[PDB]
Amino acid sequence: TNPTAFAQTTRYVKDSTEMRTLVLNLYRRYLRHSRGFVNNYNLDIPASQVRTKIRQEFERQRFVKDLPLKNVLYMKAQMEFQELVNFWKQQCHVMQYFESIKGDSFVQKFLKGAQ
Amino acid sequence: SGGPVPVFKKYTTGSKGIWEKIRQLLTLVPNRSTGNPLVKNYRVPPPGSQTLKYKDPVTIPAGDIVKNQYYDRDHRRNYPRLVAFDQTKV
């Protein structure tokens, strides 16, 4: 048995610095395929926004301190890339990923039932 | 044993008369049944028109009125206890 395309071994890193090199490397790999993501997924937006929204999700996890949290967020980091490259997700999923979208006043939420 | 069986010993519809002799002259294996069940034998008293009056079966030790205390045959509560042998007990 052989692994599929763009696959990677799952190793639990033990050094903080080692992970960031993998994290930074992976970021361009997302950026490199951005035009192909638009072409393969027939996205209605230019590739510029595709590169735009990739960067934001990396920063969302920037400030994690404990190491065991760092690996799992990197293990799942690779998996989402691998599925995206190999055209495994359908066009419906990718559109809805980038098609996502100030809070109401207290009276307004109160008026319509709030939460 | 599972030896070959003459066709007229199987519960399927089979030809009679001149056509039986034709059937035996032309078939490769003359003892092969057509597979159409006998109308006069297969399911003839349907499941809803039987004659057997069913009675609930009860073995004596577990269905008796006497010598039938439940704690004797209460196996669900006599289950083997779970014991783990650590290194210390070994």
């Binding site: 052989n2 | 609930d56 669900r76």
Partner: protein, 160 residues
């Protein structure tokens, strides 16, 4: 044979073993398993005994309707069996049978309650489909169709 269960130890039947590990061998073994089934089926028709078909234990088996409508304790057990259920002593198990597809097994974890705590189902097709890559390596598209059929992939079991 390894763990005989449910009267499979009483009847006499043979098994067929291949030698080439190819689709033609598995075709022959299945056609033998047809005739060994027809050999067991006859014996069960001749050796069928009389008696209860279920445990004579109304705390795990519903009482007969006639006894339910006439005996007070039957009505209590009929009531608690169909609403509360029956409790299973705590522990766990791994029970395997010779399913027609292969070895099918369940890993049920009990907690002393009336609902299983865990139930993992080991479907033969799921373990077969993993080996598809290791087998199909070096074959043509018309040959893949044979390998799927020789595996017996009903995908309800694979995608349990």
């Amino acid at each position: 044979k390894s763990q005989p269960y449910d009267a499979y130890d009483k009847v006499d039947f043979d098994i067929a073993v291949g030698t080439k590990g190819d689709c033609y061998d598995r075709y022959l073994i299945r056609m033998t398993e047809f005739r060994q089934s027809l050999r067991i089926i006859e014996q069960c028709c001749n050796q069928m005994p009389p008696g209860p078909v279920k445990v004579e234990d109304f705390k795990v088996a519903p009482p007969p309707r006639a006894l339910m409508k006439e005996d007070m304790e039957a009505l209590i057990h009929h009531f608690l069996l169909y609403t509360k259920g029956y409790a299973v002593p705590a522990g766990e198990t791994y029970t395997a049978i010779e399913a027609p597809k292969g070895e099918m097994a369940v890993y049920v974890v009990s907690d002393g309650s009336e609902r299983p705590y865990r139930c993992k189902i080991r479907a033969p097709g799921f373990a077969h489909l993993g080996a598809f890559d290791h087998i199909a390596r070096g074959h043509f598209l018309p040959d893949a169709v044979a390998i799927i059929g020789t595996m017996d992939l009903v995908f309800g079991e694979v995608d349990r």
